[PDB]
Amino acid sequence: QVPTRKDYGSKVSLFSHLPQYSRQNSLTQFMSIPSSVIHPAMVRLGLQYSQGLVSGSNARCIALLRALQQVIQDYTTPPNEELSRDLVNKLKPYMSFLTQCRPLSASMHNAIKFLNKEITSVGSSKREEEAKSELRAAIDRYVQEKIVLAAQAISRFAYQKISNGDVILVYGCSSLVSRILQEAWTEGRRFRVVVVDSRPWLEGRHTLRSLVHAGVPASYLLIPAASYVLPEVSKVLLGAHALLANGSVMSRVGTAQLALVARAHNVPVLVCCETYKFCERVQTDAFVSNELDDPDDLQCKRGEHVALANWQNHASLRLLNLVYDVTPPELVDLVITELGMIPCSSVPVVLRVKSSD
Amino acid sequence: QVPTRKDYGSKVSLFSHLPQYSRQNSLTQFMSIPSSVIHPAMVRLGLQYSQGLVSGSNARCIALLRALQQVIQDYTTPPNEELSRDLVNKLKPYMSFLTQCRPLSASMHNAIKFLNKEITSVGSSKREEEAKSELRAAIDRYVQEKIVLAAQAISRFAYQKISNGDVILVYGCSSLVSRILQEAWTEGRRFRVVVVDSRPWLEGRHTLRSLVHAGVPASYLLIPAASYVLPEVSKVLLGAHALLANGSVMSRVGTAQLALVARAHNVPVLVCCETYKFCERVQTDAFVSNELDDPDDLQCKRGEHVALANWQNHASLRLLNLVYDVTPPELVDLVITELGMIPCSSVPVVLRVKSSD
Amino acid sequence: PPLQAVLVADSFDRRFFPISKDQPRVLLPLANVALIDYTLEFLTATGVQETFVFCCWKAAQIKEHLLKSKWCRPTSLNVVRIITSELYRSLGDVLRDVDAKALVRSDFLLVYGDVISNINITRALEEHRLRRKLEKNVSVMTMIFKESSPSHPTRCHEDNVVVAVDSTTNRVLHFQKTQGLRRFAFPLSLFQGSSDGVEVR
Amino acid sequence: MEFQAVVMAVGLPVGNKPLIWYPLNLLERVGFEEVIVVTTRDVQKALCAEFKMKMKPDIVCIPDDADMGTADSLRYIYPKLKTDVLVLSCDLITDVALHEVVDLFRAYDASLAMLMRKRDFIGVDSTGKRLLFMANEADLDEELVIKGSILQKHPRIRFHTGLVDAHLYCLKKYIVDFLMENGSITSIRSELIPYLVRKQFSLKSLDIYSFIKEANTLNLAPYDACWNACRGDRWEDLSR
Amino acid sequence: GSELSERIESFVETLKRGGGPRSSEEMARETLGLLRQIITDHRWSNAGELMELIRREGRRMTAAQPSETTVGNMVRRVLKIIREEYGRLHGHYAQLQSNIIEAINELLVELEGTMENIAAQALEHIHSNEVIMTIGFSRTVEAFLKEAARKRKFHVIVAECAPFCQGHEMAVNLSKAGIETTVMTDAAIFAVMSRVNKVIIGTKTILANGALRAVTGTHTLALAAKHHSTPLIVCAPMFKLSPQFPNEEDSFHKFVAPEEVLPFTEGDILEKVSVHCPVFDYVPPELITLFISNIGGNAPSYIYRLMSELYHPDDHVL
Amino acid sequence: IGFSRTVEAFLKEAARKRKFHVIVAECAPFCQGHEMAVNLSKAGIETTVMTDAAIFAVMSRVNKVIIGTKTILANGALRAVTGTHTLALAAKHHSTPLIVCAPMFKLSPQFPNEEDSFHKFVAPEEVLPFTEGDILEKVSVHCPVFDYVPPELITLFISNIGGNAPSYIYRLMSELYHPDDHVL
Numbered sequence A, B: 001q002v003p004t005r006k007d008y009g010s011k012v013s014l015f016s017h018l019p020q021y022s023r024q025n026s027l028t029q030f031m032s033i034p035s036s037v038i039h040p041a042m043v044r045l046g047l048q049y050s051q052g053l054v055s056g057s058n059a060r061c062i063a064l065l066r067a068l069q070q071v072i073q074d075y076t077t078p079p080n081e082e083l084s085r086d087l088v089n090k091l092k093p094y095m096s097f098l099t100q101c102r103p104l105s106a107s108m109h110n111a112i113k114f115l116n117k118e119i120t121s122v123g124s125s126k127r128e129e130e131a132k133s134e135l136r137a138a139i140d141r142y143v144q145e146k147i148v149l150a151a152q153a154i155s156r157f158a159y160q161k162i163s164n165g166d167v168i169l170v171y172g173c174s175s176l177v178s179r180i181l182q183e184a185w186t187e188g189r190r191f192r193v194v195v196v197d198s199r200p201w202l203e204g205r206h207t208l209r210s211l212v213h214a215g216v217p218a219s220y221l222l223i224p225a226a227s228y229v230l231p232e233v234s235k236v237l238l239g240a241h242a243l244l245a246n247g248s249v250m251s252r253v254g255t256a257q258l259a260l261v262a263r264a265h266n267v268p269v270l271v272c273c274e275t276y277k278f279c280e281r282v283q284t285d286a287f288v289s290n291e292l293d294d295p296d297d298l299q300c301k302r303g304e305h306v307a308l309a310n311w312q313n314h315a316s317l318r319l320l321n322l323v324y325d326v327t328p329p330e331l332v333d334l335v336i337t338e339l340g341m342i343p344c345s346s347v348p349v350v351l352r353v354k355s356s357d
Numbered sequence C: 001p002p003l004q005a006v007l008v009a010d011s012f013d014r015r016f017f018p019i020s021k022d023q024p025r026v027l028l029p030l031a032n033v034a035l036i037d038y039t040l041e042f043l044t045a046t047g048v049q050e051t052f053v054f055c056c057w058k059a060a061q062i063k064e065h066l067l068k069s070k071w072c073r074p075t076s077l078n079v080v081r082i083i084t085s086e087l088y089r090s091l092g093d094v095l096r097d098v099d100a101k102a103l104v105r106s107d108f109l110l111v112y113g114d115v116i117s118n119i120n121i122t123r124a125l126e127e128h129r130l131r132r133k134l135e136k137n138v139s140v141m142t143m144i145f146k147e148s149s150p151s152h153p154t155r156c157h158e159d160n161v162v163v164a165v166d167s168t169t170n171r172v173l174h175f176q177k178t179q180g181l182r183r184f185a186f187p188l189s190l191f192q193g194s195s196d197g198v199e200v201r
Numbered sequence D: 001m002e003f004q005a006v007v008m009a010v011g012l013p014v015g016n017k018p019l020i021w022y023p024l025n026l027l028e029r030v031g032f033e034e035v036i037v038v039t040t041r042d043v044q045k046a047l048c049a050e051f052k053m054k055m056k057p058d059i060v061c062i063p064d065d066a067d068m069g070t071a072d073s074l075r076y077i078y079p080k081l082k083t084d085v086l087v088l089s090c091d092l093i094t095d096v097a098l099h100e101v102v103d104l105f106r107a108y109d110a111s112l113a114m115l116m117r118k119r120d121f122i123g124v125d126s127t128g129k130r131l132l133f134m135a136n137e138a139d140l141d142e143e144l145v146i147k148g149s150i151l152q153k154h155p156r157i158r159f160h161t162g163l164v165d166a167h168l169y170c171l172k173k174y175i176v177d178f179l180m181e182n183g184s185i186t187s188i189r190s191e192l193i194p195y196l197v198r199k200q201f202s203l204k205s206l207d208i209y210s211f212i213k214e215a216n217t218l219n220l221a222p223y224d225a226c227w228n229a230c231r232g233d234r235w236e237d238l239s240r
Numbered sequence E: 001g002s003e004l005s006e007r008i009e010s011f012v013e014t015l016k017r018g019g020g021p022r023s024s025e026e027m028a029r030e031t032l033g034l035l036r037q038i039i040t041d042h043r044w045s046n047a048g049e050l051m052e053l054i055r056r057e058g059r060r061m062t063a064a065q066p067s068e069t070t071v072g073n074m075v076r077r078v079l080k081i082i083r084e085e086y087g088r089l090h091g092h093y094a095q096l097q098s099n100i101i102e103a104i105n106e107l108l109v110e111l112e113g114t115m116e117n118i119a120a121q122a123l124e125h126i127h128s129n130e131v132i133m134t135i136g137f138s139r140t141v142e143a144f145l146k147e148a149a150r151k152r153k154f155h156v157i158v159a160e161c162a163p164f165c166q167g168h169e170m171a172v173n174l175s176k177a178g179i180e181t182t183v184m185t186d187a188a189i190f191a192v193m194s195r196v197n198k199v200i201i202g203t204k205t206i207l208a209n210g211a212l213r214a215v216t217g218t219h220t221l222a223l224a225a226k227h228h229s230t231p232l233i234v235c236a237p238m239f240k241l242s243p244q245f246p247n248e249e250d251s252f253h254k255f256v257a258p259e260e261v262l263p264f265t266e267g268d269i270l271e272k273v274s275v276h277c278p279v280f281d282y283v284p285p286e287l288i289t290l291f292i293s294n295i296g297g298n299a300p301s302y303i304y305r306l307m308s309e310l311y312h313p314d315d316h317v318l
Numbered sequence F: 001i002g003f004s005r006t007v008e009a010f011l012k013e014a015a016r017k018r019k020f021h022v023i024v025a026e027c028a029p030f031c032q033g034h035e036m037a038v039n040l041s042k043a044g045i046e047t048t049v050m051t052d053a054a055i056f057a058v059m060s061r062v063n064k065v066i067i068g069t070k071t072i073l074a075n076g077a078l079r080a081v082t083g084t085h086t087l088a089l090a091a092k093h094h095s096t097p098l099i100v101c102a103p104m105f106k107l108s109p110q111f112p113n114e115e116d117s118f119h120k121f122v123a124p125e126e127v128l129p130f131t132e133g134d135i136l137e138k139v140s141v142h143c144p145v146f147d148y149v150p151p152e153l154i155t156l157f158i159s160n161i162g163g164n165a166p167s168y169i170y171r172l173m174s175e176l177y178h179p180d181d182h183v184l
Ligand SMILES: O=C(COc1ccc(Cl)cc1)N[C@H]1CC[C@H](NC(=O)COc2ccc(Cl)cc2)CC1
Pocket: A012, A013, A014, A320, B012, B013, B014, B320, E129, E130, E131, E155, E157, E182, E184, E192, E195, F021, F023, F048, F058, F061, F062
C-alpha cells in the first residue's frame, strides 16, 4: 500500500533513530494519481507539509483540521460497521502518511487526540450526515475558540505588560507573537522590536514584514548578534511550539540558547503558548524526539565556494540541521496563556484543568 | 632489551591510549637475574612501584632519589665519552622501565627534570668521583630542603590557620597532611579529624592509625557519607600530588568530587602541596593523562557470590578505577606551600620563581 | 527439624563479686536492657523455635524478670522453658540434666545467658548438617568464633584463646587459653594425624 | 653486578646426564655470566677435573677440604665475594621459574629468600610469602613452641609439613658478614635459617621470604629420589 | 484472630530485624495483602473506627523501620481509599466492604504493572550512543535500561556503593544483555561527570518537597549533575511517594553496623574512632529534573499535586 | 566555532593517533566553518556540521570546547569570531572546559571598555540581502563579526610555550609588553 521514504544522506550517530528524509523526492512517486489509500485532501496536506510551504505550527494544525473537515465531508458509512471505530481505523493510515511526510508537531498530535476523543464520543442513535455536521461544527468551533480567542486573550495579557519605550526581542516566525506586537502597536504602545533569525529557514524575515506593514520600527539581526543586542534589549518575547510536562519549552532551535544568553544578560524571557500545544509527553534534551530536515539545506552562496556541495563523497562527513530543541525550566520566566500569566511549573496543572478534571 | 608489558583486561573506549597493567603480571619474567640492561636499584624500585608497596608521592620520589643515588654511586665512565651526555643517555631507559612498571608521579617527573638540569650543568674538566660526590650531595640537599624544610614551613603555616574547637576533614593518605595534624595536635590545638576513605586502595586506614597513635580523636568515614558530615565539617584538608598551570589539583581520585560537595556545603578546601610538585604540563579532565590500576581490584567478597571474579566472560563489561583527577580552579581555596598561603592562580607563578628567573 | 537451644542462665564463675550477690549476673543491664533480653533476642533473631533456660542461683529473680518480658508472651515466636534446680552447679550437670530429661531432638544451640551477638549462624548450621550427613553423625561440635585482632580491647588476658585448625575442612585440632602462659605448646600428633594442611589461629 | 651464584658440592653425576650440568645451565640461561662453583673433596677430590670438562662460558672451580660444611664453604670464599650470594646445590633439578624468589628478594628487600616444593614443620604468614617459623624434632626436646610476639604481630600462621628445601637461597652482605664473624656455624641450612628466623622475631628488623612452588621437585643425596631424576630429565630437559 | 495477629507481628519483626522481603514491590504487595487480611477479619460500624485501627497498626509499622516508608504511605493511601469511599457513600456495611476490596484489587492491578509501564515509556527518554550513569541497584532502572536497549545502543556507567557494593549485581545482570557498561567507584563521579550525558537513577522514598532519600552517594551525583547541568531521571514507582517532609521528623537516615565501612580486624584504634555508616542520602528537589512513574513524567514542582491526588493532611503524622 | 588554521591543524594532527569527533559550527555572517569541515573531513575525524543556533541544543553532549580567537585582551578576555560568547556561556553552564588555541602575537594590552572601539561592523548584505524589498528602509541591520568573551568563561589558553590560565595573562602581558606603550 503505502511504502516508507528512504533515508537521505549519512545520519548522525546520536540521531540514528530519528528519520531524515529529503525534499527533492516524495512518497507519491509510487502512489496512485487518484489517491485511493490516502485521501486527496490528505495527500495535498502531505505535499504542502513535505515541501516546507506550511511550516508554522498554528498554520500546520489549521491546515490539518481543514483537511480533516474535507475528509469528514467526503466520508461515507459502510454496512455492518460503526462510525466511531471505522473512522479511527481509517484515520491512522492518514496520520501515518502525514508522519512519513514530516514529523508531526505537538499541536497536530493534540488535534489528533481531541479528534479521537470527539469522534469516539458520538452516539449510535444519531444519523450519518447529522453526526458529520456535528463533528464539522465541533472541529471549527474548537479551532475558532482555541486559536482566535486564545490569541486575543494572550495579546490582552501581553498589552498590560509591555511598557512604553520598551525594547522587545523576538525569534523565528509565528502568528501569535506578530499578532501580539501588531495589537500592541495599534493599541497605543510605542516600542521597537529586535528580530533574531537563524539559518537555513530565514523565516523571521516573514515576521519582519509583519513588523513593517504595521509601522513598528524594527531591527534585524541573527543569533551571533543576539549577544551584542541583548544589553540593549529590555524584554524577550518568544513563540513556543510545544510545552512539556516539566515546564520545558520545545520550540525552534535558537530559543534555549537565546534564553540562556538572555538570562546571562538579565533579560527575562516570555514565551507565548496555548493550551492545545501542551504535552503530557516529556523530554529533557533535543536528542530523543526531534525533527531532522535536509542535510542539503546548510550549503550557502558565498561567491562560488560551496564547500558542502559534494558532502556525500566524504565518508567521514556528517551533516545535521535541527528544527526543535528543549529549554530547561530554569531559564524561562513567563508563560502567557489565555488563563493568565503562569510560570513553567504550572504547565501540566493547567492540563489537569484542560482534561476536564 | 626490555619488551612492552601485556596490557590486562578489556580497556575503556575513552581510556584506549592509557595503559592498564596488572599486579600479578610483572616485567622481570624475561629479564636477567643479574640485571645488566636495567640497574639493580632501578629494577628494585620498579618492583617496589609495581606491587603497590610505595604509593605516596613523596615516598615514591624519595625512593626514586635513593635509587638514583645508588645508580650514581655504582656508575662508571667509558673512554672517550663525557658524563653530561652519557648519563642522560643511560637514565632514559631507566625512566622508561620505571614508566613501564607504573605511570610516574609528577614529583618523579620534576625530579627527573631537576636531575637532568643538574647533570647537564657538570663541566667535563671536573673529575669522575668528584662530580659524582657533588651530584650525590646535590640530590641529598635537594631532597633535604624540599622534603623537611617544606614540610616544616607548611606545618607552621597551617598551625596559624587551624583554630581551637575546629573539625577537620581529610581524604586519602599523605605524609604532609598527617604531619600537619600531628604537629598541630602536639603544639597546642585541640581538634578532631574526620577521615574520608574510598575503594579499592583503603589507604585512609594509614592516616587513621597515624591520627590515633598521635592521640587525636578520629572519625572514619567513606566518600558517600561525606555529604552527611560536611554540614558538620568546618574545614577540609587535602593532600595534593600535583598542581597544574591552570590551578587544577591532581591528587587521589576523590578530590574534585569532595571539593564540589564541600563548596556545596560552604566548607573551604585547603590542599597541601610542595613547590617541587608543580607542573608546566596542564590538563582539564581525568581522561587525557591518568593512571589505570588493576581491573581485578574492584571485586569484593560480600558473602558467597563474588560477581566480578570472572568478569572477562562478558564482552560488554568494562572495569575501571581512576587514580588521578583534576579539580576546577574555582573550587579549591587555599594552596599552602613553603612560600606561604597562595591561591591556585599562583601555581605557575611560583614556578616562575622556581625556574631561576 | 525444629531448632532447639540450651541456655545457661547462671555462669558459675566467681568474677562479679560482690556485684552478683544482689542480682544475678544475667540480669546486669548494659544500656537499659539486661543481658538475658539480648540473648533471647539473638536466639529469636537467628530462628530458634524453643529454648531451655537453666538458672540456678537467685533464680526466682530471673523468673520474675523473664516472665514479664516479650519472650513469655503468647504472641512471641520463640517459646522458652524455665528449668530451675538447686542441685546442678556447672554446665556439665546442665547437659546431663538435658540428656536425662530428653529435651533436645536434633542439633541444639548451647549458649550462655550473657552473650551479645547478631551472628547469623544458619550458615554454620547448614555446614554442620552437611558434616553430620557426610560424616554419618561423627561431626560433634561447631565452635563459632569471630575475627578480631590480638591487640583489640575486647579480648582480655583471661579470655584470649589460641586454636590450631585444619584449614581445608575447618576442624579444631588444638585449643588452649593464654592465661598465664607466654609460651604455647602444640602437640605433634596433630601434624602426623592430618597432613592436608594446618594453620594456627 | 647484583648476584654471585655459588654452587655447593658436599656428599656425583649419577644419572642420564651430568648432575652439575642442570644448575649451571639454569644459571647461564638467565644471566649469571660468572659462576663460582665449589668442588667436592669428602667422597673424592677429583671431580673438579670432571667439572672443567663442560662447555659453559665461564666457570670458577676451586679446591676444597674434605671435612667442611656449607657455612665453612661460604666462609672460605668470603674475601672474593662483593655482592649478594645466591646459593645452589648439585642434586637439585628444578623446573621452577627462578625469577619468583628473586622478585621476592628485590620487592620487599629481604635478608634471605628461599624456594620450597611439595619432617620439617614450617610456619608462613597468610600472605604465603613471608615465613615466620621452621623446626624439626632432630633438635627439639619439647613438641612445638611459638613465640608470643609473632602471634601478636601475625595472628594467623599457616603451617606446612610436606615441604622440602630445594637449597636455593638469596643471602645479603651482612648475613655473610655475621656468618664470617660467627665461626660456630657449620651447616648453613640449619644455621642461617633458624638463627635468622629467631632474630626476625624482634619496627626496624629483617625480612625472610619463601616461595612454595607446585610445578616440580628437587632431589636428594641418597638413592631415595634417584629413581625419579631420570623420569624428570626425560620430560623436562627437552624444553631447556 | 490468632493467625492475623501472628502474621501482623511477624511482619513487624521482619521489618524490625532485616530486609524482608527483598525489594519494595514485593513488600507493597505483602502490605496490601496484610491490610486486606486485616479488613476481612474485623468488625466495625463507623469508618472512623477502622481508620483509627489502621492508624494504630500503622504507627507500630512505621515504628518498626522508619527508613522503610513503603508501608507508611501504603497505609496512608489505603486510609485515603477509606475516606474517599466513605465520602462517596455518605452523600453501608457489606457494599462498602466489597467496594474497599475492589479498590484494593484496583491498587494491586496498578501496582503489578508499574515496571512494565515504566518500560513502555522508557523509549522516549533514551537515544542512541548515550552515556547513562546509575547508582546503587534497583529493578526499576534495570528494567528501564534492559527495555531501552532492545532498540537502542548506548552506554551505562553503573557505580558501586562504597559501604556494600550492590551495583556489581546490576553490572553483571546488564552485561548479559549487552549494554557496554562500565564499573567504577563512587570516588570518580565528578572525575567522569564531564562525559556523562544523562543521569538515570532510582530512589527509596519520594518526599513531599520533591526531595528524595535514596542509596548513599547520590546527593553527590545530583550535585555534580547540577554542576554539569545534565538532567536527572528518577525511575520511581507510585508507592515510594511519601508526605513526610525532610527536616520535619527524626530517624531520617538508617544507620547500620560499621562493619561494612571499617572491619573488626583493624586493631585497638577502633575504640578511639567514630565510624558511622548512613546507607541513605538526601537529595533536594532543586537538584532533580524529572521523575518517571507509571503514569508518565512529572516535575519536582508537581509532586505535591500528586500528594493531593493520593494523600490527606490529617493522616500525615499517622 | 569559526575557521582558524591553528585549530584545524591541531585537530588534523591529533587525529593521527587518536579517534574522536569534531563538531564544526558555522557562523552566520560568513559560514567559514564549511571550509574547516571539508578540511577536517579529509583527515577523517568524523566531522559533524551544524548551525549556530543549536549550540545549547548540542552542549549536553560536547565534552570540551576547543576554539581559536582573534585577539587576547589584557585581563584574560578575548575577542573572537562572533557567536562564541554564547558558546562560552553554554560551556560555562555545562561546566565544560574551554581550550583557546591561540598564539602570542594575538596578545593585546587593549582593555575592553576603551572608547567603544571593540566590534568590527561589516556590510549587512550577508545578514539581510539587498533584494529583500522596500522593508530595508525602515529596518536597522547590524552585522558584528567579532564577539567579547570574559576571562571567567575561559578555562585554559594554549600558546606555543605551553598551557596558561586566564589568571596568568597579566604575566605574559608584563613579559611581552610595557605599560608605557599602551597608548602607542
Ligand atoms: O564511548 C563511550 C563510552 O562512554 C564512557 C564509558 C565509560 C566511562 Cl568511565 C566514560 C565514558 N561513549 C561515546 C558515546 C557517543 C559520543 N559521541 C559520538 O560518538 C559522536 O559525537 C557527536 C556527534 C554529533 C553530535 Cl550532534 C553530538 C555528538 C562519544 C562517546
